[PDB]
Amino acid sequence: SIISFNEANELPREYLEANWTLDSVFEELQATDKKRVLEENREHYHIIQKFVILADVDGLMDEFSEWLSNGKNLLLGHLLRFMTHLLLFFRTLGLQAKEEVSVEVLKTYIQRLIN
Amino acid sequence: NMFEIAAPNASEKTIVDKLFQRDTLVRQSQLVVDWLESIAKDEVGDFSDNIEYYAKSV
Amino acid sequence: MRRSKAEIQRYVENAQNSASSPREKSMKGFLFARLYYEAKEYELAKRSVSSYISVQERDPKAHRFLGQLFEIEGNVEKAVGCYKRSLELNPTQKDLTLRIAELICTLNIKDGRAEYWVERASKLFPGSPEIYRLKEQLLSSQGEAGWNQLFDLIQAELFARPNDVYVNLKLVDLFLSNQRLEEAVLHCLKPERRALRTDIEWCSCVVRVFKEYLASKQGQKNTNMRMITKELLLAQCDVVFLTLSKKDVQKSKEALERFDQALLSVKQSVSGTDASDLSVTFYEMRGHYYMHAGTLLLKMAQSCEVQWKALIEPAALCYLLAYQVPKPKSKPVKGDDNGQGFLEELAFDRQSKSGHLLLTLSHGKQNFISEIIETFANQCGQSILLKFLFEDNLSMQDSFMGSDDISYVENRVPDLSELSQHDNGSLRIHNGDLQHLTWLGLQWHFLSTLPPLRKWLKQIFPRVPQETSRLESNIPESICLLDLEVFLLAVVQTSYLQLQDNNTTADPNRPRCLPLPICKQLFTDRQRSWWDAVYSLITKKALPGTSAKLRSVIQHDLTTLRAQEKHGLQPAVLVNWARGLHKTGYSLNSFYDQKEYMGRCVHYWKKLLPLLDLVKQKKSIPEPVDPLFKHFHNKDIKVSEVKDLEDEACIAFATLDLVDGKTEDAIIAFESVKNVVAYWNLALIYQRKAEEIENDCLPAEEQEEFQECLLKCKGFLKMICDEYSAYPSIATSLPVPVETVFEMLDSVKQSLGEAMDDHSPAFMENHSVLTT
């Protein structure tokens, strides 16, 4: 927009004519060919952090459905309490989720409470 | 927001501060950067005092 | 840079006088084009951008800027070309793809390129009304299979989102095109349209569909035709109401004529067969038509077509007829209990609206209703109404002003209690509004009385019963009855001031409260938006995402409306608020109620004490935060009333100490200063304890102590009456008028007995009746 005669950073045309966004970060993070990063991008807390950063809803509810289908072989009482509190804070702030996943969260929370 | 001023001036810090209000992407980027810096600072712990147990001089 | 254009051009020339290099000159010209676009110079901006582009086309940002400039100017081909180039240079964007798709759809292209681009845009943006419209256009620009896939897409969109007025209209149009009148009627008779009938277009389309179905099916045959006619009457009433709410006299008259011919066609079948809920529906629809005719008359009087001196009587007659229309009857046949309940609620709402409008037309006086009943309620008035409405367009047998159901008004005046009982059932259709709240408040205030809006509040929002005594208000959801009453008082005062200011521009024959449809703005936009946000947060009308801002606004407004200890308000305004609170509270007499009211009074006096000390040294009080009051003649600075306010505060503190247990301080403050508030509170406490004692079985000693307490209360009331008769200032000093004291004396005389009192009185009933 002003002057371009001396390239301070040696970036070719493939990098000069490309507007980077936010999804490319997750794209390259999932495309990481390293086995360590590939295993870290498939656990629980890493994907939770990624979904919290991306503020997604479709993939988030899909992964929650897969978690509910798998069962309680990953979540615990403190995890369920934190998830319920986060959902309550999100509902108090703005937007909401689905009635099915909401009643499932509520029934799992009260089951853990009575346990 | 609203844009009306686009003439540049001296010192690129002013242009950076003006562009900071033009897009929130770099805003949350630098926010996450500062958050990671604070995470590293909290994870370092009492290393400043642990150094004194073996800091040299000569 | 719009401003300093001379300096901008000077800087540009100074930079060009020393600039060099082809690429540097090109980017400098691009910067100059951006500056020209900012300073509104589209021609020069486009010229410079084209000059920069000709020197090796590059930069996706420059490409999309050139595309936007071409779209602003008027080159669709170059615009879509630059958009496509920018989208191909950028790593798969969304806004550029949507713009390209919408441009191709506006240019109308039915090719694989357009199909793929629209599919990509729909995959990038889920739903989207523009995307749905483009898909509908593409599916309709085909043939039979195109119509089939368009109907399938419409059904899918309706199943995904039911609250879709555009989808409903498209489905109705497709049904009308494919001659699916039965399917259109089935889709229209759904009970989920209560939230979609808020628009005039949907209701008009429903009316047209029902009229087409009736014209296609000729007469009736089963109960389906009766239900269709009832739904058509409801939709037509909604159409007339929405046209009255809007600003279009021609559309209002057209809707009134449509409702008239619909009522005529419905009565033509009512007089034949099918005698059930159809008669009640026709009665309620005729009442609503009379109400709408009166509303249209008032609207044209406001728009200045016929003077008010010739319209204050036809509108009053219309309201009287709508109020005295035959009452709904119990018709539980055909299994329509919910329908009968809805018809009864609509009849009650129409009765309440007619009574309120008649009271506003009569203003403070009540003889106008009797005058209209005994004079204008005749065939001459009916003919005058017909001439003012339809003139000579329709006939006597076709219209209702002159023929068909005439002479049915009962000799009675709609009382405030009847109006409240009607509103209790009226507040169930579409809830209430701030306009109607101010209407009821002004109607109850212009008669030296208080509005008993507790039942109305419990009906509209069933939460938090009874006025509570709190120290702060920061809950936007659960609103307090006392705060709502204070807000209603403030809005009523603001509306009265607005009416007094606007009455100097029109005729004084206008009603005190303008109707809600034809006038929705009669106060402050701040409180209007506050009430709108409150109603949205209550009835879930706001969109999922806009709630925190409304809650913060309500919290910031209530903490200033309820006042604090030191904020910057005025002592006169605080005294007026306290007087209004006392007037609204002293009507309900109870132990805990009086305790909470005394606590609230003590809190108000403690908050006013830091502000009352500034008046002793003559200090100027700044203007308050809420601009709901004017500083002309209603609000001023207290001069010699500071001593009276301090005496009232001391009396309140003494009464609180006597209620608690500080009898020494109570008698000390009583010997210091004396007033009538302490005597009134003592009499109220004595009557309350006497009633609590009488609630149980009483032998001789308990009966004699009850008689002694009654005699003490009667002596206190006699002293109050003597003080009021010695000088006519007690009704102006105390927050409650002399009517409250008279009612208290009457209740005491009734509770004393009739001819069996063990203790003979020693006073004479002044300005009251003799019961014992």
Coordinates of all heavy atoms in Angstrom, one line a residue, chain C residues 254-328:
Chain C
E254 N -59.8 0.3 3.5 CA -59.9 -0.9 2.7 C -60.1 -2.1 3.6 O -60.9 -3.0 3.4 CB -58.7 -1.1 1.8 CG -58.9 -0.4 0.4 CD -57.7 0.5 0.1 OE1 -56.6 0.3 0.6 OE2 -57.9 1.4 -0.8
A255 N -59.3 -2.2 4.7 CA -59.4 -3.3 5.6 C -60.7 -3.3 6.4 O -61.3 -4.3 6.6 CB -58.2 -3.3 6.6
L256 N -61.2 -2.1 6.7 CA -62.5 -2.0 7.4 C -63.6 -2.5 6.4 O -64.5 -3.2 6.9 CB -62.7 -0.5 7.8 CG -63.9 -0.3 8.7 CD1 -63.6 -0.9 10.1 CD2 -64.3 1.2 8.8
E257 N -63.6 -2.1 5.2 CA -64.6 -2.5 4.2 C -64.5 -4.0 4.0 O -65.5 -4.7 3.9 CB -64.4 -1.8 2.9 CG -64.8 -0.3 2.9 CD -64.5 0.4 1.6 OE1 -64.8 -0.2 0.5 OE2 -64.0 1.5 1.7
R258 N -63.3 -4.6 4.0 CA -63.1 -6.0 3.9 C -63.7 -6.8 5.0 O -64.4 -7.8 4.9 CB -61.6 -6.4 3.7 CG -61.1 -6.2 2.3 CD -59.5 -6.2 2.3 NE -59.0 -7.4 2.9 CZ -57.7 -7.4 3.5 NH1 -57.0 -6.3 3.5 NH2 -57.3 -8.5 4.1
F259 N -63.4 -6.3 6.3 CA -64.0 -6.9 7.4 C -65.5 -6.7 7.4 O -66.2 -7.6 7.9 CB -63.4 -6.2 8.7 CG -63.6 -7.0 9.9 CD1 -63.8 -8.4 9.8 CD2 -63.5 -6.5 11.2 CE1 -63.9 -9.2 11.0 CE2 -63.6 -7.3 12.3 CZ -63.8 -8.6 12.2
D260 N -66.1 -5.6 6.9 CA -67.5 -5.4 6.8 C -68.1 -6.5 5.9 O -69.1 -7.1 6.3 CB -67.8 -4.0 6.4 CG -69.2 -3.6 6.8 OD1 -69.8 -4.2 7.7 OD2 -69.8 -2.7 6.1
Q261 N -67.6 -6.7 4.7 CA -68.2 -7.6 3.8 C -68.0 -9.1 4.3 O -68.8 -9.9 4.1 CB -67.6 -7.5 2.4 CG -66.3 -8.2 2.1 CD -65.2 -7.2 1.5 OE1 -65.4 -6.0 1.5 NE2 -64.1 -7.8 1.1
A262 N -66.9 -9.3 5.0 CA -66.7 -10.6 5.6 C -67.7 -10.9 6.7 O -68.3 -12.0 6.8 CB -65.3 -10.7 6.2
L263 N -68.0 -9.9 7.6 CA -69.0 -10.0 8.6 C -70.4 -10.2 7.9 O -71.2 -11.0 8.4 CB -69.0 -8.8 9.5 CG -68.1 -8.9 10.7 CD1 -68.2 -7.6 11.5 CD2 -68.5 -10.1 11.6
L264 N -70.7 -9.5 6.8 CA -71.9 -9.7 6.1 C -72.1 -11.1 5.6 O -73.1 -11.8 5.7 CB -72.0 -8.7 5.0 CG -73.2 -8.9 4.0 CD1 -74.5 -8.6 4.6 CD2 -73.0 -8.1 2.7
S265 N -71.0 -11.6 4.9 CA -71.0 -13.0 4.4 C -71.1 -14.0 5.5 O -71.7 -15.1 5.3 CB -69.8 -13.3 3.5 OG -69.7 -12.3 2.4
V266 N -70.6 -13.8 6.7 CA -70.6 -14.7 7.8 C -72.0 -14.7 8.4 O -72.6 -15.8 8.7 CB -69.6 -14.4 8.8 CG1 -69.9 -15.0 10.2 CG2 -68.2 -14.9 8.4
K267 N -72.6 -13.5 8.5 CA -74.0 -13.4 9.0 C -75.0 -14.1 8.1 O -76.0 -14.6 8.5 CB -74.4 -12.0 9.3 CG -75.7 -11.8 10.0 CD -75.8 -12.5 11.4 CE -77.1 -12.4 12.0 NZ -77.4 -13.5 12.9
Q268 N -74.7 -14.0 6.8 CA -75.6 -14.6 5.8 C -75.7 -16.1 6.0 O -76.8 -16.7 5.8 CB -75.1 -14.3 4.4 CG -75.5 -12.9 3.9 CD -77.0 -12.7 4.0 OE1 -77.5 -11.7 4.6 NE2 -77.8 -13.6 3.4
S269 N -74.6 -16.8 6.4 CA -74.6 -18.2 6.8 C -75.1 -18.5 8.2 O -75.6 -19.5 8.5 CB -73.3 -18.8 6.5 OG -72.8 -18.6 5.2
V270 N -74.9 -17.5 9.1 CA -75.3 -17.7 10.5 C -76.8 -17.7 10.5 O -77.4 -18.5 11.2 CB -74.7 -16.6 11.4 CG1 -75.5 -16.4 12.7 CG2 -73.3 -16.9 11.7
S271 N -77.5 -16.8 9.8 CA -78.9 -16.8 9.7 C -79.6 -18.0 9.1 O -80.8 -18.1 9.1 CB -79.4 -15.5 9.0 OG -79.1 -14.3 9.8
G272 N -78.8 -18.8 8.5 CA -79.2 -20.0 7.8 C -79.2 -21.2 8.8 O -80.1 -21.5 9.6
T273 N -78.1 -22.0 8.7 CA -77.9 -23.1 9.6 C -76.6 -23.0 10.4 O -76.0 -21.9 10.5 CB -77.8 -24.4 8.8 OG1 -76.9 -24.2 7.7 CG2 -79.2 -24.7 8.2
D274 N -76.2 -24.1 11.1 CA -75.0 -24.1 11.9 C -75.1 -23.1 13.0 O -74.5 -22.0 12.9 CB -73.7 -23.9 11.1 CG -73.4 -25.1 10.2 OD1 -73.7 -26.2 10.7 OD2 -72.7 -24.9 9.2
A275 N -75.8 -23.4 14.1 CA -75.9 -22.5 15.2 C -75.2 -23.1 16.4 O -75.7 -23.9 17.2 CB -77.4 -22.3 15.6
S276 N -73.9 -22.6 16.5 CA -73.0 -23.1 17.6 C -72.1 -21.9 18.0 O -72.5 -20.9 18.5 CB -72.2 -24.3 17.2 OG -73.1 -25.3 16.7
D277 N -70.8 -22.2 17.9 CA -69.8 -21.2 18.2 C -69.7 -20.1 17.2 O -69.0 -19.1 17.4 CB -68.4 -21.8 18.5 CG -68.2 -22.2 19.9 OD1 -68.4 -21.4 20.8 OD2 -67.8 -23.4 20.1
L278 N -70.3 -20.3 16.0 CA -70.3 -19.3 14.9 C -71.0 -18.0 15.3 O -70.5 -16.9 14.9 CB -70.9 -19.9 13.7 CG -70.5 -19.2 12.3 CD1 -69.0 -19.1 12.2 CD2 -71.1 -20.0 11.2
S279 N -72.1 -18.1 16.1 CA -72.7 -16.9 16.5 C -71.9 -16.1 17.5 O -71.8 -14.9 17.4 CB -74.1 -17.3 17.2 OG -73.9 -17.5 18.5
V280 N -71.2 -16.8 18.4 CA -70.3 -16.1 19.3 C -69.2 -15.5 18.6 O -68.7 -14.3 18.9 CB -69.8 -17.0 20.4 CG1 -69.0 -16.3 21.5 CG2 -71.0 -17.7 21.1
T281 N -68.6 -16.2 17.6 CA -67.5 -15.6 16.8 C -68.0 -14.4 16.0 O -67.2 -13.4 16.0 CB -67.0 -16.7 15.8 OG1 -66.6 -17.9 16.6 CG2 -65.8 -16.2 15.0
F282 N -69.2 -14.4 15.5 CA -69.7 -13.3 14.8 C -69.9 -12.1 15.7 O -69.7 -11.0 15.3 CB -71.0 -13.7 14.1 CG -71.9 -12.5 13.8 CD1 -71.5 -11.6 12.8 CD2 -73.0 -12.3 14.5 CE1 -72.4 -10.5 12.5 CE2 -73.9 -11.2 14.2 CZ -73.5 -10.3 13.2
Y283 N -70.3 -12.4 16.9 CA -70.5 -11.3 17.9 C -69.2 -10.6 18.3 O -69.1 -9.4 18.3 CB -71.2 -11.9 19.2 CG -72.6 -12.3 18.9 CD1 -73.2 -13.3 19.8 CD2 -73.4 -11.7 17.9 CE1 -74.5 -13.7 19.6 CE2 -74.7 -12.1 17.7 CZ -75.3 -13.1 18.6 OH -76.6 -13.5 18.4
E284 N -68.2 -11.5 18.6 CA -66.9 -10.9 18.9 C -66.3 -10.2 17.7 O -65.6 -9.1 17.9 CB -65.9 -12.0 19.4 CG -66.0 -12.3 20.9 CD -66.5 -13.6 21.2 OE1 -66.5 -14.5 20.3 OE2 -66.9 -13.9 22.3
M285 N -66.5 -10.7 16.5 CA -66.0 -10.0 15.3 C -66.7 -8.7 15.0 O -66.1 -7.7 14.6 CB -66.0 -10.9 14.1 CG -65.0 -12.0 14.1 SD -63.3 -11.4 14.4 CE -62.6 -12.9 15.0
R286 N -68.0 -8.6 15.3 CA -68.7 -7.4 15.2 C -68.3 -6.3 16.2 O -68.1 -5.1 15.9 CB -70.2 -7.6 15.3 CG -71.1 -6.5 14.6 CD -72.5 -6.9 14.5 NE -73.2 -6.6 15.8 CZ -73.6 -7.5 16.7 NH1 -73.5 -8.8 16.5 NH2 -74.3 -7.1 17.8
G287 N -68.0 -6.8 17.4 CA -67.4 -5.9 18.4 C -66.1 -5.4 18.0 O -65.8 -4.2 18.2
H288 N -65.2 -6.3 17.5 CA -63.9 -5.8 17.0 C -64.0 -4.9 15.8 O -63.2 -4.0 15.7 CB -63.0 -7.1 16.7 CG -62.5 -7.8 17.8 ND1 -63.3 -8.7 18.6 CD2 -61.3 -7.8 18.4 CE1 -62.6 -9.2 19.6 NE2 -61.4 -8.7 19.5
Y289 N -65.0 -5.1 15.0 CA -65.2 -4.2 13.8 C -65.7 -2.8 14.3 O -65.2 -1.8 13.8 CB -66.2 -4.8 12.9 CG -67.0 -3.8 12.1 CD1 -66.4 -3.1 11.0 CD2 -68.3 -3.5 12.4 CE1 -67.1 -2.1 10.3 CE2 -69.1 -2.6 11.7 CZ -68.5 -1.9 10.6 OH -69.2 -1.0 9.9
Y290 N -66.5 -2.8 15.3 CA -66.9 -1.5 15.9 C -65.7 -0.8 16.5 O -65.5 0.4 16.4 CB -68.0 -1.7 16.9 CG -69.3 -2.2 16.4 CD1 -70.1 -3.0 17.1 CD2 -69.7 -1.8 15.1 CE1 -71.3 -3.5 16.6 CE2 -70.9 -2.2 14.6 CZ -71.7 -3.1 15.3 OH -72.9 -3.5 14.8
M291 N -64.9 -1.5 17.2 CA -63.7 -1.0 17.8 C -62.7 -0.4 16.8 O -62.2 0.6 16.9 CB -62.9 -2.0 18.7 CG -63.6 -2.4 20.0 SD -63.9 -0.9 21.0 CE -62.2 -0.4 21.3
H292 N -62.6 -1.2 15.7 CA -61.7 -0.7 14.6 C -62.3 0.5 13.9 O -61.5 1.4 13.4 CB -61.5 -1.9 13.6 CG -60.7 -3.0 14.2 ND1 -59.8 -2.9 15.2 CD2 -60.7 -4.4 13.9 CE1 -59.3 -4.1 15.5 NE2 -59.8 -5.0 14.7
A293 N -63.6 0.6 13.7 CA -64.2 1.8 13.1 C -64.0 3.0 14.0 O -63.6 4.1 13.5 CB -65.7 1.5 12.9
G294 N -64.1 2.8 15.3 CA -63.8 3.9 16.2 C -62.4 4.3 16.2 O -62.0 5.5 16.2
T295 N -61.5 3.3 16.1 CA -60.0 3.6 16.0 C -59.7 4.4 14.7 O -58.9 5.3 14.7 CB -59.2 2.3 16.1 OG1 -59.7 1.6 17.2 CG2 -57.7 2.7 16.3
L296 N -60.3 4.0 13.6 CA -60.1 4.7 12.3 C -60.7 6.1 12.4 O -60.1 7.0 11.8 CB -60.7 3.9 11.2 CG -60.7 4.5 9.8 CD1 -59.3 4.9 9.4 CD2 -61.3 3.6 8.8
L297 N -61.8 6.3 13.0 CA -62.4 7.6 13.2 C -61.4 8.5 14.0 O -61.1 9.7 13.6 CB -63.7 7.6 13.9 CG -64.9 7.2 13.0 CD1 -66.2 7.0 13.8 CD2 -65.1 8.3 11.9
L298 N -60.8 8.0 15.1 CA -59.9 8.7 15.9 C -58.6 9.0 15.1 O -58.0 10.1 15.2 CB -59.5 8.0 17.2 CG -60.6 8.0 18.3 CD1 -60.0 7.8 19.6 CD2 -61.3 9.4 18.3
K299 N -58.2 8.0 14.3 CA -57.0 8.2 13.4 C -57.2 9.3 12.4 O -56.3 10.2 12.2 CB -56.6 6.9 12.8 CG -55.3 7.0 12.0 CD -55.0 5.7 11.2 CE -53.6 5.7 10.7 NZ -53.3 4.3 10.1
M300 N -58.3 9.3 11.7 CA -58.6 10.4 10.8 C -58.8 11.7 11.4 O -58.5 12.8 10.8 CB -59.8 10.0 9.9 CG -61.2 10.1 10.5 SD -62.0 11.6 9.9 CE -62.5 11.1 8.3
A301 N -59.4 11.8 12.6 CA -59.5 13.0 13.4 C -58.1 13.6 13.7 O -57.9 14.8 13.7 CB -60.3 12.8 14.6
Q302 N -57.2 12.7 14.1 CA -55.8 13.1 14.4 C -55.1 13.6 13.1 O -54.4 14.6 13.1 CB -55.0 12.0 15.0 CG -53.6 12.3 15.4 CD -52.8 11.2 16.1 OE1 -53.0 10.9 17.3 NE2 -52.1 10.5 15.3
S303 N -55.4 12.9 12.0 CA -54.8 13.3 10.7 C -55.5 14.5 10.1 O -55.1 15.0 9.0 CB -54.9 12.1 9.7 OG -54.3 12.5 8.4
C304 N -56.6 15.0 10.8 CA -57.3 16.2 10.4 C -58.0 16.1 9.1 O -57.6 16.7 8.1 CB -56.3 17.4 10.4 SG -55.5 17.8 12.0
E305 N -59.1 15.3 9.1 CA -60.0 15.3 7.9 C -61.4 15.8 8.3 O -62.0 16.5 7.5 CB -60.1 13.8 7.4 CG -58.8 13.3 6.9 CD -58.8 11.8 6.8 OE1 -59.8 11.2 6.3 OE2 -57.8 11.1 7.1
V306 N -61.9 15.4 9.5 CA -63.2 15.9 10.0 C -62.9 16.4 11.4 O -62.2 15.7 12.2 CB -64.3 14.8 10.0 CG1 -65.6 15.4 10.5 CG2 -64.4 14.2 8.6
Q307 N -63.5 17.5 11.8 CA -63.2 18.1 13.1 C -63.7 17.2 14.2 O -64.6 16.3 14.0 CB -63.9 19.4 13.2 CG -63.3 20.5 12.3 CD -61.8 20.5 12.3 OE1 -61.2 20.2 11.3 NE2 -61.2 20.8 13.4
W308 N -63.1 17.3 15.4 CA -63.4 16.5 16.5 C -64.8 16.7 17.0 O -65.4 15.9 17.7 CB -62.4 16.7 17.6 CG -61.0 16.3 17.2 CD1 -60.1 17.0 16.5 CD2 -60.3 15.0 17.6 NE1 -58.9 16.3 16.4 CE2 -59.0 15.1 17.1 CE3 -60.7 13.9 18.4 CZ2 -58.1 14.0 17.2 CZ3 -59.8 12.9 18.5 CH2 -58.5 13.0 18.0
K309 N -65.4 17.9 16.8 CA -66.7 18.3 17.3 C -67.8 17.4 16.6 O -68.9 17.3 17.2 CB -67.0 19.8 17.1 CG -67.2 20.2 15.7 CD -66.6 21.6 15.4 CE -67.1 22.1 14.0 NZ -67.0 21.0 13.0
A310 N -67.5 16.8 15.5 CA -68.4 16.0 14.8 C -68.0 14.5 14.8 O -68.7 13.6 14.3 CB -68.6 16.4 13.3
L311 N -66.9 14.2 15.5 CA -66.4 12.8 15.6 C -66.4 12.3 17.1 O -66.2 11.1 17.3 CB -65.1 12.6 15.0 CG -65.0 13.0 13.5 CD1 -63.6 12.8 13.0 CD2 -66.0 12.1 12.7
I312 N -66.4 13.2 18.1 CA -66.4 12.7 19.5 C -67.7 12.0 19.9 O -67.7 11.3 20.9 CB -66.2 14.0 20.4 CG1 -65.4 13.5 21.7 CG2 -67.5 14.6 20.7 CD1 -65.2 14.7 22.6
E313 N -68.7 12.0 19.1 CA -70.0 11.3 19.4 C -70.1 10.0 18.6 O -70.5 9.0 19.1 CB -71.2 12.2 19.1 CG -71.1 13.5 19.9 CD -72.2 14.5 19.5 OE1 -73.3 14.0 19.2 OE2 -71.9 15.7 19.5
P314 N -69.8 10.0 17.3 CA -69.8 8.7 16.6 C -68.8 7.7 17.1 O -69.2 6.5 17.2 CB -69.5 9.1 15.1 CG -69.9 10.5 15.0 CD -69.6 11.1 16.3
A315 N -67.6 8.1 17.5 CA -66.7 7.2 18.1 C -67.1 6.7 19.4 O -67.0 5.5 19.7 CB -65.3 7.8 18.2
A316 N -67.7 7.6 20.2 CA -68.3 7.2 21.5 C -69.4 6.1 21.3 O -69.5 5.2 22.1 CB -68.8 8.4 22.3
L317 N -70.3 6.4 20.3 CA -71.3 5.4 20.1 C -70.8 4.1 19.6 O -71.3 3.0 20.0 CB -72.3 6.0 19.0 CG -73.4 5.0 18.5 CD1 -74.3 4.5 19.6 CD2 -74.2 5.7 17.4
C318 N -69.8 4.1 18.8 CA -69.1 2.8 18.3 C -68.5 2.1 19.5 O -68.7 0.9 19.6 CB -68.1 3.1 17.3 SG -68.6 2.7 15.6
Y319 N -67.8 2.8 20.4 CA -67.3 2.1 21.6 C -68.4 1.6 22.5 O -68.2 0.5 23.1 CB -66.4 3.1 22.3 CG -65.2 3.7 21.5 CD1 -64.7 4.9 21.8 CD2 -64.7 2.9 20.5 CE1 -63.7 5.4 21.0 CE2 -63.6 3.4 19.8 CZ -63.1 4.7 20.0 OH -62.1 5.1 19.3
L320 N -69.5 2.3 22.7 CA -70.6 1.9 23.5 C -71.2 0.6 22.9 O -71.5 -0.3 23.6 CB -71.6 3.0 23.6 CG -73.0 2.6 24.2 CD1 -72.8 2.4 25.7 CD2 -74.0 3.6 23.9
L321 N -71.4 0.6 21.6 CA -71.9 -0.6 20.9 C -71.0 -1.8 21.1 O -71.4 -2.9 21.4 CB -72.2 -0.3 19.5 CG -73.4 0.6 19.2 CD1 -73.5 0.8 17.7 CD2 -74.7 -0.1 19.7
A322 N -69.7 -1.6 20.9 CA -68.7 -2.7 21.1 C -68.7 -3.2 22.5 O -68.4 -4.3 22.8 CB -67.3 -2.2 20.7
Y323 N -69.0 -2.3 23.5 CA -69.0 -2.7 24.9 C -70.3 -3.4 25.3 O -70.3 -4.4 26.0 CB -68.8 -1.5 25.8 CG -68.7 -1.8 27.3 CD1 -67.6 -2.5 27.8 CD2 -69.8 -1.5 28.1 CE1 -67.6 -2.8 29.2 CE2 -69.7 -1.8 29.5 CZ -68.6 -2.4 30.0 OH -68.6 -2.8 31.3
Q324 N -71.4 -3.0 24.7 CA -72.7 -3.6 25.0 C -73.1 -4.6 24.0 O -74.3 -5.0 24.0 CB -73.8 -2.4 25.1 CG -73.4 -1.4 26.1 CD -73.7 -1.8 27.5 OE1 -74.4 -2.8 27.7 NE2 -73.1 -1.1 28.5
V325 N -72.2 -5.1 23.1 CA -72.5 -6.2 22.2 C -72.9 -7.4 23.1 O -72.5 -7.5 24.2 CB -71.3 -6.5 21.3 CG1 -70.3 -7.4 22.1 CG2 -71.7 -7.2 20.0
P326 N -73.8 -8.3 22.6 CA -74.2 -9.5 23.4 C -73.0 -10.2 23.9 O -72.0 -10.4 23.2 CB -75.0 -10.3 22.4 CG -75.6 -9.3 21.4 CD -74.8 -8.0 21.5
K327 N -73.1 -10.7 25.1 CA -72.0 -11.4 25.8 C -71.8 -12.8 25.2 O -72.8 -13.4 24.7 CB -72.2 -11.5 27.3 CG -72.4 -10.1 28.0 CD -71.3 -9.2 27.7 CE -71.6 -7.8 28.1 NZ -73.0 -7.4 27.6
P328 N -70.6 -13.3 25.2 CA -70.4 -14.7 24.7 C -71.1 -15.7 25.5 O -71.2 -15.6 26.8 CB -68.9 -14.9 24.8 CG -68.4 -13.9 25.8 CD -69.4 -12.7 25.7

